[PDB]
């Protein structure tokens, strides 16, 4: 019987994190972030950092009996950004070409019906 995993993908604009878990989602089978692979902080949310860490986690999973995967793309949500970071689809191709059988790929962004007040004050961040 083939094995299927859950690939949480939290892609922020400052970093990207890929977290592989069992079908229950309660067991941490592989977990690699951008800081693992790059040396510059500005390089963390780069597509290269996402995809190579994704491939490393994918080979770890392949070593550990997982063949298929479902992807849970997560955004910051809440009062923060809703758009997944740039590394989302790049990492998706990374697992697809890493030899895993890609299953359902779904957004899991926590979207409030109406949540707390965001950061930035009333005028926002006046950068």
């Amino acid at each position: 019987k083939e094995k299927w995993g859950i690939a949480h993908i939290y892609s922020s604009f400052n970093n990207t994190i890929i977290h592989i878990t069992d079908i229950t989602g309660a067991e941490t089978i592989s977990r690699w972030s951008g800081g693992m692979v790059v040396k510059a902080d500005r390089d963390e949310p780069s597509p290269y950092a996402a995809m190579l860490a994704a491939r490393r986690a994918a080979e770890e999973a392949l070593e550990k009996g997982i063949v298929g995967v479902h992807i849970r793309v997560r955004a910051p949500g809440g009062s923060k950004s809703k758009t997944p970071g740039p590394g989302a689809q790049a990492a998706i191709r990374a697992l697809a070409r890493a030899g895993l059988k890609i299953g359902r790929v779904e957004d899991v962004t926590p979207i409030p019906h109406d949540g707390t007040r965001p950061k930035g004050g009333r005028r926002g961040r006046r950068v």
Partner: protein, 184 residues
């Protein structure tokens, strides 16, 4: 290497779903498998691709060695499906109810209706009262498992649409989410 202490355990569906094989889960101890949620699409169980968007969270509650049997916790539709169903110039109508079943189960059932156009909120209130009456009637009539199957199959949605057509034609009626509040 902690991973080498882990051992696999077969999971299984609810009996009213035939207890089909949904998958395996690795764990160090049988106890930790208790009270574990697994989300599974309906295409996995019934084999129907037309009902892929439907999803069932089953709580793992029983462990016999390597074989894990699960309880039904909740039902939810796909967010992409719901979002596609929602559109501008069409009225979303939510009906959220607490229900006590014939066999004593407590169920929080929330359902959607989307019409052809923008409609007066009095008609929305009337339609709310309508499927509230229908769902209460079926909850009284049906036990837990049978009501679960009818809710998933959409027969409740079909009846709701057919009745509410007297108030306004409905683009679609659906049962968005169901939660198992308490068992008897």
């Amino acid at each position: 290497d902690k991973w080498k202490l882990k051992q696999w355990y077969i999971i299984y569906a609810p009996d009213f779903f035939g207890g089909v094989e949904v998958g395996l889960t690795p764990a160090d101890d049988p106890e930790k498998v208790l009270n574990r949620v697994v989300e599974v699409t309906l295409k996995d169980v019934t084999g129907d691709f037309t009902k892929s968007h439907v999803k069932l969270y089953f709580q793992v509650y029983d462990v016999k060695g390597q074989n894990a049997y699960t309880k039904f916790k909740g039902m939810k539709l796909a967010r992409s499906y719901i979002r596609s169903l929602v559109r501008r110039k069409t009225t979303r109508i939510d009906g959220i109810f607490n229900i006590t079943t014939k066999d004593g189960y407590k169920l929080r059932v929330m359902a959607m209706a989307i019409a052809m156009r923008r409609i007066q909120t009095s008609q929305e209130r009337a339609i709310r009262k309508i499927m509230q009456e229908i769902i209460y009637k079926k909850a009284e009539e049906l036990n837990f498992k049978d009501f679960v199957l009818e809710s998933v199959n959409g027969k409740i949605a079909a009846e709701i649409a057919k009745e509410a057509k007297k108030i306004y034609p409905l683009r679609k009626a659906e049962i968005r989410k169901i939660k198992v509040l308490e068992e008897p």
